[PDB]
């Protein structure tokens, strides 16, 4: 099984379908999923080396698919196909203080113009990601880099800031969603579903750009929900109908628990019926 599209049509009535007896046939197709891509090597993510590059031990990019610093080449950080091409978005995870320089780099040599984080820094006391860009207006050194960032835009459920980077320059966009409490679910569909179509929105705007950077913690299930989410709102919008189970399958081709919890799982088919609904 790699794939269970659903008819648009047919919806409402699957979904009921698949949260009967307790998310009963949901828990099964989660469950199916959960193999996915897990055949695959992890070995230069396990090298000594890179063993301070990691935030959790057991969340490794694969070798095939991981995402490479030009050249000791190790971030984690891994590509990830999209509705639209194959290296559409770059993963990794929320970055530390030790690889913070890593990520700017790996930012300017791929040609990131738009930076997704769907994480808070800490959350219930437990630190979840470094506060890797300028906390102000003053410019900073990362590495051979100096970003300045150029504006913040706070907004209840969202943050929008600009930066502009330079080498040894080019404008850089940064969505941060604060309010997706890490292994849940936002409190409600719209937002989200709203903030995947402003960032789809500004990547549309951006010509030229290279993948999309998205990141979270670990980079898996915040992520990997937001990425989803991204790809069947564009399949709501050309197809007779979605294929939340075959989107989730490919993101596991490509990284671990890409989609982490049963919840974020279920939450991507709310998240549909609720558009449909709209719609109809
Ligand atoms: C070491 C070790 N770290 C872990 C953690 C964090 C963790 C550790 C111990 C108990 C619960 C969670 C890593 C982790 C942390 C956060 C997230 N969520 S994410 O930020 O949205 O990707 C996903 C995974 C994890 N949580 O789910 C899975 C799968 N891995 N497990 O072993």
Request: hydrophobic share 35%; with cysteine.
């Amino acid at each position: 099984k790699t794939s269970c599209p659903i008819k648009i049509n047919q919806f409402e009535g699957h979904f009921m379908k698949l949260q009967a007896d307790s998310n009963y046939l949901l828990s099964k197709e989660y469950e199916e999923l959960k193999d996915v891509g897990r055949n695959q090597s992890c070995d230069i993510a396990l090298l000594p080396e890179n063993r301070g590059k990691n935030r959790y031990n057991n969340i490794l990019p694969y070798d095939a698919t991981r995402v490479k610093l030009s050249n000791s080449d190790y971030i984690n950080a891994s590509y990830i196909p999209g509705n639209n091409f194959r290296r559409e978005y770059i993963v990794t995870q929320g970055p530390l203080p030790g690889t913070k320089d890593d990520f700017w780099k790996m930012v300017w040599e791929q040609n990131v113009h738009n930076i997704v984080m769907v994480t808070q820094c800490v959350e219930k006391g437990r630190v979840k990601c470094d506060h890797y860009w300028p906390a102000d207006q003053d410019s900073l050194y990362y590495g051979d880099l100096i970003l300045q960032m150029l504006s913040e835009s706070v907004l209840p459920e969202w943050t929008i800031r600009e930066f502009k980077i330079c080498g040894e320059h080019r404008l850089i966009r940064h969505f941060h969603y604060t309010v997706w409490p890490d292994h849940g679910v936002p409190e409600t569909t719209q937002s989200l579903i709203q903030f995947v179509r402003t960032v789809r929105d500004y990547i549309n705007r951006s010509p030229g750009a290279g993948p999309t950077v998205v990141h979270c913690s670990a980079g898996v299930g915040r992520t990997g929900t937001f990425i989803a989410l991204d790809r069947i709102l564009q399949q709501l919008d050309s197809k007779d109908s979605v294929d939340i189970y075959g989107a989730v399958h490919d993101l596991r081709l490509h990284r671990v628990h890409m989609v982490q919890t049963e919840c974020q799982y279920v939450y991507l088919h709310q998240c549909v019926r609720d558009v449909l609904r709209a719609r109809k």
